[PDB]
Symmetry: C3
Subunit: 234 residues, 3 copies
């Protein structure tokens, strides 16, 4: 799969690669399109919000590889709010969101569920990262269904309840997104384990965002993103 949608740079000290490391690795591993999704600013060991605002300066294409500007936002509360400002939204192409302890501590199932669904229903998010995380128990079918209705993808995460999530998305009719959640560029694009989960449930290839750059970019346009001309040839 020549698209990877979820990775981290030194903007967090618990990651260790830069933008240039990811471009170089993509070139080496035949990746044509990727997104940098640093942790949102309310998280501990996450960058300043300006880190997201100033991504508007990034080149679109380097050595043939397209680059998407993203964030892995933190879900803050049962209202589905995330630590992403309007100014931040304007600079970004890809909005991923998910549960991280220091921002949202695992609560009762029903709380986690309502907070995830509200985030999905908000219209402000493209992808929920690692919803299969055992630390945050949720009603999977209810989430998948909400995700299908609001056209949000549920992540199947390599770094990483994922079979349940995958079969759920299969039946609800939604999108699955694949993400390495790389904290170094060495695991970029590495989905072997994700792939097994999907095979074990016979997931339809037609609903994997990562199959091609164009399929992923079509999805972002369906969600309201103005087309990115520099990406036409991908």
């Amino acid at each position: 799969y020549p698209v990877d949608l979820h990775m981290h740079t030194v903007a967090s000290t618990h990651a260790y690669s830069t933008l240039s490391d990811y471009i170089a690795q993509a070139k080496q591993k035949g990746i044509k399109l990727f997104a940098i999704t640093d942790h949102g600013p309310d998280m501990e060991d996450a960058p300043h919000h300006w880190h997201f605002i100033n991504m508007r300066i990034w080149p679109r294409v380097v050595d043939g590889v397209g680059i998407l500007r993203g964030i892995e936002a933190n879900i803050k509360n049962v209202d589905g709010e995330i630590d992403c400002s309007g100014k931040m939204f304007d600079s970004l192409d890809l909005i991923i969101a998910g549960f991280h302890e220091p921002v949202f501590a695992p609560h009762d199932k029903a709380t986690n569920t309502q907070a995830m669904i509200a985030t999905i229903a908000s219209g402000n998010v493209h992808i929920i990262s690692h919803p299969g995380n055992p630390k945050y128990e949720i009603d999977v079918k209810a989430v998948a269904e909400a995700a299908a209705k609001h056209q949000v993808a549920l992540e199947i995460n390599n770094s990483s309840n994922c079979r349940e999530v995958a079969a759920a998305v299969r039946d609800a009719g939604g999108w699955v997104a694949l993400g390495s959640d790389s904290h170094t560029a060495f695991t970029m694009g590495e989905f072997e384990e994700c792939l097994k989960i999907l095979d074990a449930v016979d997931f339809p290839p037609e609903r994997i965002l990562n199959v091609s750059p164009r399929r992923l970019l079509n999805f972002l346009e369906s969600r309201g993103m103005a087309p990115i001309a520099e990406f036409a040839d991908l």
Copy 2:
């Protein structure tokens, strides 16, 4: 122009390239001499002051490219003080200074003007970055004149009232410095827009610091910098 004097590294999370990225880009784009000028420590999302003190360890030359140790200091007050310590000064070659909100909020014209002039007159600065910034209204002619008298260059900034600044420096007789104010290495040395401003006013090429490494280094020696032997051949 084979010299670029103003750029930023990951030491701020709103920048995204390292020292090694800038060296590699310079090599690719035919740049023979550059300066890293991270934001001064009083600014938000800026490094620890040790970041400037420890630049004394940097190699002078890599792959034929010379490397200047610098800072983009923040002007703090009407007295022309900047967030650069004596220990910091001893490690550095190039001192740039300018107005940044979190440290100095735009005030009345007269305030901005006196603070800029005092910074220029202090003797502690080589270059005022983006003085043409509309956010900080100033008496241009008075600044240019002060800059000519104190032998400080006024920046014409690519990242970016610049025609007014340029014609002013033209008539006052001072130096202009060109800076990409790159926050990634991809725009290093990129002055196309600066160049247009200068052409529109018929600026004398003889007063552009960036024409050659030697011209820039002669200027730093005129301001009191002991000569840098590793740079002789540039």
Copy 3:
């Protein structure tokens, strides 16, 4: 010597290279094994503790170079405690510890001495960095002896009382470790000055850890480290 055991990345703003810069430099300079030892979290301008915990994701080998996960911990008190947690210990291979001002201010000789000896006796440390630092006066022979008894190496530090330390380790019978204490990858593996100190005292080559990867890794196994299979061929 094809092993360097002490260097720093951008996780501190007073360093300027990444993991990928160090791998690239090692390849260029014929280094087969190195360790990244960022400053411990209690220090100023040091990373979040997660920076050490998440090193468990690092690849073992890149371009033929083996990579050790380490920390330069800070000695906190006369009890020999360091700013390294149990969770942090589990992710790491190499534990270096030493005196740094903001965490432990130089005290009377006897204090520095007891704090260093206690750190050595704790069993939690492999190497004391720059014990020859004049800022922290110590009873050298007592330290070396303790180091020999507890099988801890004393660093002879290039970045840098080192002749006294070296002759002391010579007579006490302990290990010496060589470290560049690089804050950029450009000085990686650079021990010329260390080497002179050792020659001046006729130090036995048999007791220099850095002679070969296997000798260094044998020492870590003697201290209780489960063997690292990916390193067999080094």
